């Protein structure tokens, strides 16, 4: 049938949070408390659009 559309490799380029699992776990509660608004916006976009290409930004 159709042709599946994928974003280009430049659109997937971002600098990463290069920390291990225990570094994330130690500050997990404060990360949830302080950075809640963009995380919840991303999660709402994710559960609504059902498409990661619409939630890349």
């Amino acid at each position: 049938p159709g042709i599946v559309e994928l974003p280009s490799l430049e659109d997937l380029k971002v600098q990463e949070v290069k920390v291990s699992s225990s570094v994330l776990k130690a500050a997990a509660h404060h990360y949830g408390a302080q950075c809640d608004k963009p995380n919840k916006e991303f999660m709402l976009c994710r559960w609504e659009e059902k498409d990661p290409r619409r939630c890349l930004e």
């Binding site: 999660m43 994710r46 559960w47 059902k50 990661p52």
Partner: protein
């Protein structure tokens, strides 16, 4: 004999006419029922031959543990 026991010819005439009308109506209804049954079996859009499908009231609509669904 014709006064006591026998029936009038007019009575038999009109009785036969009533019987013929009823039986012709029945035969036409039987043929129409056959045609209706054939059409409903072929197309499946009528009230008969409605084989069941999955009821859609069983589908869960709440958000799941994974967004991609």
């Amino acid at each position: 004999i014709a006064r006591t026991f026998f029936d009038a010819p007019e009575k038999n005439y009109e009785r036969t006419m009533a019987i013929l009308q009823i039986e012709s109506e029945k035969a036409e209804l039987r043929l129409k029922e056959l045609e209706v049954r054939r059409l409903m079996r072929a197309k499946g859009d009528g009230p008969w031959f409605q084989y069941p499908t999955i009821d859609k009231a069983l589908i869960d609509h709440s958000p799941k543990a994974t967004p991609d669904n």
